[PDB]
């Protein structure tokens, strides 16, 4: 059919959910990938299908690195083709985020989760996306990669690797007409359980309005990058951070 | 009431495309120019034919000098005089030519033109833009600087031009930080190769085109304008201090 | 009270020159290797001939797996076993080969390219830091000046090297309170791949503004020596490009 | 015989340390100064006491003006006159003060000083240095700033000048590589604090630095310059070495 289709990873909640909704509002059919949040994913799909029948499906997968991750990533892309006959956009949003101090989970599990979700799964999804082909990929990066959270080495390594993928894939996929870009939030949606006192500490550091980005503001940048208004843009990462990364210690 | 924009060096090429696209989006525009009077007036006539009293021209040299601050203050004042407001500033005007380090313009003229157009004038226009707002919620004020995706892999023998564009990156960042509390966003658009020089031969143009991964061709002026329009829009209201490369992957390509 | 250094992938090429220069500077060295056993033992022999009991070898595969943490721990332990201390870690070992997006399985390619270039450095950094509770301690990561202008079809490799820049920064921040500095050296073109043909090698050489030639291994090693030295005691989280201007050259 | 170096702004603080360490390494030195004649001569006297006729001074204002090209030519010429050669240029002199965007010196004077010292003078000195050349180890070292991407509030012009200096470093490295002239930078974070800065403010800055919660000594900055001019950096050009104790890694 004539409406384009997008895969959004980690789409049940928060930023991924807002991205899925905005893509849907723009006219895309969506694959809502999720790991543990089945109820939320299904709720979103039902909402979107109420708006337009047969325009949303869910796809469950763990994006932890392992021997089966390549197959899992191939399956996610295939789900979009099975549902909608095409796959125009891939949004790599899903992400593990927790500290891994240099000095519970084994360290190999932490590597698998943090590097898998933030870098390896994006790479494998990118491979599967390209092999099956205004086509574009958008990677959710992090404006703070050069001024990282203390004791978040593996997470930071994963997001750095994702910048490399964005560049490498933009270069390699350009001949196929597939653009590859990034959106780099600073502080957006905070953890719900984070105390407001801690939330406000982060908010007050942001020059532009002393507030976090909404999920919708992050989604707006993704929508620009997949649009016809970005058709010469490839290998670019758009910071959406309210000036946070410009603020010295 | 429609918002108003100043676009420097807007008579032709990329600056014209930005002015046109802003005007199509609903802005009133000040078309600043230096030598290209006929082209500036022609553009303003076309825009005014589309919507009466929505375009004016403003002449100024943006070469650095002791009067440049007054010239820059006057450009911003022209927008307020014509339209009663100034919501957007686009720093597009630019001198571009080689200044070899080893060997009829004096070097001091070259510094004045290359650093003036690309960096000092943007700074002064930024100051004047910000100061004029002090006499004013639904507002959406911003500045867009035309940067250069190739600043870290520069053209051979273009040191002063390169220095000017690096300075413009610094201004983008410094002004984003300092003007955020006033609700003025400050961002950049960094072309790779877009409209090639008028005097460049076709063989040389094709040499540049063939290096671009995405389509083996230069950006259209409209493609560059699209990124400016995004940055001024409500879809970018949390974006400040960002420079969007619009280069078809050119900067990713090794030697 | 000679300090001791671990250099990964030290049997040949750049890692060998690093081990040699560290030894010349007065370090005792652990020559880590994977497959190049003969070269590793030959080097240790040369170094021990110069100063007895100053070099040992340590074999390990640095491919990512569930045993990699134990392997990395063992490398660091080998330094303490031999020398009773470990002052310097040089993360040099590296897999480098294309992985196009469009008979190794992709999972093996991920494990080798991301393991050697990023995960092993991380685990070795962890083990190095945790063994320190007893100076001029530092870590040097061999990065790549071309990470932002990467080789076509080397996505996994490039991801690994980007991850290595992240580790360098993150570990510099986190280990600064323990006095452990963490920096990088980023070659452009240095010793060319053994499998590369002469015409192709010459193509790469001609790209380099400063002398139209590749860096020697000794030139790369000179920057490592500086970073571990007393003349770099306030330097942490810095990556020194050693590329003859190659990265400045547009397409 | 011995190589020769020009260090701008060499009478005090970081520039003085750089000149001292180059001299100790075996260089003859031109000590450039603007207002600090007494300190400049005191340094030369100290260095000449160590090795006769190995240090001279050169006065010049590095503010941008119509005479700045001539002034920069003279600084380079002074090295050739004293020592018959000029192997190293260190661009250290620098104006540093706020220039707020929203509201003493006029703005154009502030442009002349901040952009002149931090960028235009280095460009003109680079040009003169290269023109006068056209085995050897010729290089230029620019004193940059590790904080350029997380700048001081209200320091737009200073920041623009330092960004321009990054651009010069890269452009000149590319263009001068065929002549065997390397061009690099050293980027301090917090080193010797402003003389006017209050002691409590100094401590606020010190406590931000991960590596030792202190500023860099001038000698530590000089150590990186020494490396860059040495034979141990013969393949290094277009590189900027941060010497910041991890300060630039620390988020807000
Ligand atoms: N929030 C911010 O301030 C911020 C700042 C910088 C960057 N970003 C980036 O923006 C993106 C969105 O951020 P966010 O805060 O919305 O993310 P988030 O809530 O932390 O995580 C998004 C989703 O990732 C999925 N996920 C986590 N582990 C997974 C695994 N092993 N396999 C498959 N999926 C997994 C989860 O899906 P299920 O719930 O279904 O399990 C989760 O809902 C992320 O890439 C993040 O790094 C966010
Ligand atoms: N074209 C590209 O491929 C490319 C690549 C990278 C970056 N960019 C950037 O994008 C912007 C637009 O590029 P472009 O090619 O359209 O620019 P351009 O044609 O070279 O110049 C734009 C205008 O700048 C004005 N200008 C030059 N010197 C001036 C002075 N002393 N005072 C006042 N105005 C002066 C001229 O106005 P008058 O004609 O009225 O005299 C000219 O029409 C520039 O900032 C440029 O650096 C372009
Ligand atoms: N050469 C250059 O032009 C260049 C350019 C940019 C960056 N670099 C970086 O500089 C460093 C040294 O470069 P180089 O060319 O000397 O490296 P190299 O020869 O390609 O590799 C160095 C050593 O890495 C070891 N290694 C490879 N896979 C391994 C594995 N699975 N487990 C354990 N060790 C493994 C090998 O040891 P065994 O031989 O014992 O098996 C090999 O001898 C690398 O990090 C490289 O990425 C080099
Ligand atoms: N100190 C730090 O923490 C720090 C941090 C980042 C970067 N840096 C950089 O490191 C370098 C040295 O810093 P510093 O603190 O030692 O510098 P500084 O004391 O502020 O200035 C050094 C010298 O610059 C000269 N100078 C200033 N204006 C001049 C002019 N118009 N004409 C000619 N010379 C002029 C002065 O010479 P006279 O005294 O003879 O007039 C002054 O002594 C500078 O480039 C600076 O930006 C320093
Ligand atoms: C201060 C703060 C802000 C947001 C979060 S959620 C988060 C952040 C991130 N970079 N990646 C993912 N996946 N989730 C946690 C702490
Ligand atoms: C390869 C090429 C492409 C476009 C141009 S026009 C131009 C370029 C620029 N960076 N700034 C200005 N002002 N004009 C010249 C050469
Ligand atoms: C142009 C060129 C020069 C040297 C090599 S060898 C090499 C390079 C690399 N970046 N990592 C490793 N491990 N080995 C390959 C290509
Ligand atoms: C936190 C701090 C530390 C040192 C200074 S002195 C200074 C700094 C600079 N960047 N340039 C020059 N020329 N002088 C000012 C503030
Ligand atoms: Na780039």
- Give the architecture-level CATH label for domain A1-249: 3-Layer(aba) Sandwich (3.40)
Other CB atoms closer than 10 Å to residue A126's CB: what's the count?
26
Distance between alpha carbon C107 and the CA centroid of its chain, in Å?
A: 23
Cα–Cα distance measured from residue B71 to residue B60, given in angstroms and rounded to the nearest whole number: 6
Phi, psi of C144 (to 5 degrees): -155, 120
Topology adopted by domain D1-252? Rossmann fold (3.40.50)
Distance between alpha carbon B40 and the CA centroid of its chain, in Å?
A: 15
Angle at C240 between CA C162 and CA B175, to 5 degrees: 75
Cα–Cα distance measured from residue D181 to residue D174, given in angstroms and rounded to the nearest whole number: 10
Residues in chain B: 255
Stated as kind and residue range, the H or E segment containing B186 is strand B184-191
The answer to whether residue C144 is catalytic is: yes
Return left, alpha or beta for A140; rule: phi > 0 is left, psi -120 to 50 is alpha, else beta.
beta
Asked if A146 is an interface residue toward chain C (Cβ–Cβ < 8 A), one would say: yes
**Helix, strand or coil, per DSSP, at residue A211:** coil
Give the neighbor-by-neighbor strand order of the sheet with A135-140: A56-60, A29-34, A5-8, A89-92, A135-140, A178-185, A237-240
Name the residue of A11, A16, A35, A95 to mutate for ligand 5: max ligand atoms within 8 A of Cβ.
A95
> Which residues hold their Cβ within 5 A of ligand 9, which is an ion?
B 251
Other CB atoms closer than 10 Å to residue D41's CB: what's the count?
15
Beta carbons of B121 and B168 less than 8 angstroms apart: no
The pocket around ligand 3, CB under 6 angstroms, is made up of C 9, 11-15, 33-36, 61-63, 92-96, 112, 116, 142, 144, 187, 189-191
Contacts of D153 in chain B (CB under 8 A): 177-178
Of D130, D228, D125, D122, give the one whose Cα is nearest residue D165.
D122
Of A121, A99, A147, give the one whose Cα is nearest residue A10.
A121
Cα–Cα distance measured from residue B91 to residue B175, given in angstroms and rounded to the nearest whole number: 13
**Helix, strand or coil, per DSSP, at residue D212:** coil
List the subunits that have 3+ CB pairs under 8 angstroms with B: A, C, D
DSSP A119: I
Cα–Cα distance measured from residue A179 to residue A174, given in angstroms and rounded to the nearest whole number: 6
* Bridge partners of residue C241, in order along the sequence: C186
DSSP string, B45-106: HHHHHHSTT-EEEEE---S-STTHHHHHHHHHHHHHHHHS---EEEE---------S-----
Of A232, A242, A247, the CB nearest to B238: A242
DSSP string, B201-222: -HHHHHHHHTT-TTTSSPPPHH
DSSP B198: T
The residues, any chain, with a CB within 8 Å of residue C15's CB and separated by 6 or more, are C7, C8, C9, C90, C92, C93
Which residue's structure tokens are 């469950």?
A60
Stated as kind and residue range, the H or E segment containing D187 is strand D181-188
Contacts of B98 in chain D (CB under 8 A): none
Give the neighbor-by-neighbor strand order of the sheet with D4-7: D55-59, D28-33, D4-7, D88-91, D138-143, D181-188, D240-243
Distance between alpha carbon B52 and the CA centroid of its chain, in Å?
A: 25
**Helix, strand or coil, per DSSP, at residue A80:** helix
Experimental method: X-ray
Beta carbons of B190 and B148 less than 8 angstroms apart: yes
Look at C248 and B153 and tell me if their CB atoms are within 8 Å.
yes
Which residue's structure tokens are 């190095």?
C128
Contacts of B125 in chain D (CB under 8 A): none
Cα–Cα distance measured from residue B70 to residue C155, given in angstroms and rounded to the nearest whole number: 52
Domain assignments of chain C as residue spans, ordered by start: 1-251
Structure tokens at A234: 């490839």
Beta carbons of C226 and D241 less than 8 angstroms apart: no
Minimum Cα–Cα distance from C205: chain B residue: B255
Cα–Cα distance measured from residue B228 to residue C138, given in angstroms and rounded to the nearest whole number: 45
The answer to whether residue D223 is catalytic is: no
**Sign (positive/negative) of CA torsion A167, A168, A171, A174?**
negative
Of B145, B142, B245, B119, give the one whose Cα is nearest residue B194.
B245
Beta carbons of C26 and C55 less than 8 angstroms apart: no
Beta carbons of C129 and C176 less than 8 angstroms apart: no
Cα–Cα distance measured from residue B188 to residue B169, given in angstroms and rounded to the nearest whole number: 8
The residues, any chain, with a CB within 8 Å of residue D98's CB and separated by 6 or more, are D152, D153, D154, D155, D158
Distance between alpha carbon C143 and the CA centroid of its chain, in Å?
A: 8
Cα atoms in the 13 Å half-sphere on the side-chain side of D82: 25
Minimum Cα–Cα distance from B211: chain C residue: C251
Class of domain B1-255: alpha beta
CA of B95 to the centre of ligand 4 (A): 30
Domain C1-251: give its CATH superfamily: NAD(P)-binding Rossmann-like Domain (3.40.50.720)
DSSP A191: P
- Pairs of residues, one from chain A and one from chain B, whose beta carbons lie less than 8 Å apart: 104
Which residue's structure tokens are 């893509």?
A23
Cα–Cα distance measured from residue D10 to residue D8, given in angstroms and rounded to the nearest whole number: 5
């Amino acid at each position: 059919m004539e409406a384009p289709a997008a895969v959004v990873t980690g789409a049940a909640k928060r930023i991924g959910r807002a991205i899925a909704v905005k893509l849907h509002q723009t006219g895309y059919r969506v694959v809502i990938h999720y790991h543990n949040s089945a109820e939320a994913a299904v709720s979103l799909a039902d909402e979107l299908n109420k708006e337009r029948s047969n325009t949303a499906v869910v796809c469950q997968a763990d994006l932890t690195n392992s021997n089966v991750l390549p197959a899992s990533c191939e399956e996610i892309i295939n789900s979009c083709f099975r549902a909608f006959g095409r796959c125009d956009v891939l949004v790599n949003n899903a992400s593990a985020f927790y500290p891994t101090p240099l000095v519970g989970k084994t360290v190999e599990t932490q590597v698998a989760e943090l590097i898998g979700t933030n870098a390896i799964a994006p790479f494998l999804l990118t491979m599967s996306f390209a092999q099956r082909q205004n086509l574009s990929i958008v990677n959710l990066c992090d404006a703070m990669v050069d001024q990282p959270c203390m004791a978040f080495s593996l997470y930071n390594m994963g997001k750095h690797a994702l910048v490399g993928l964005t560049q490498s894939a933009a270069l390699e996929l350009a001949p196929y007409g597939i653009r590859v870009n990034g959106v780099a939030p600073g502080v957006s949606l905070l953890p719900v359980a984070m105390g407001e006192e801690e939330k406000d500490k982060w908010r007050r550091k942001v020059p532009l309005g002393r507030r976090e980005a909404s999920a919708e503001q992050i989604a707006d940048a993704v929508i620009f990058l997949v649009s016809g208004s970005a058709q010469y843009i490839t290998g670019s990462i758009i910071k959406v951070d309210g000036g946070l990364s410009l603020v010295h210690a």
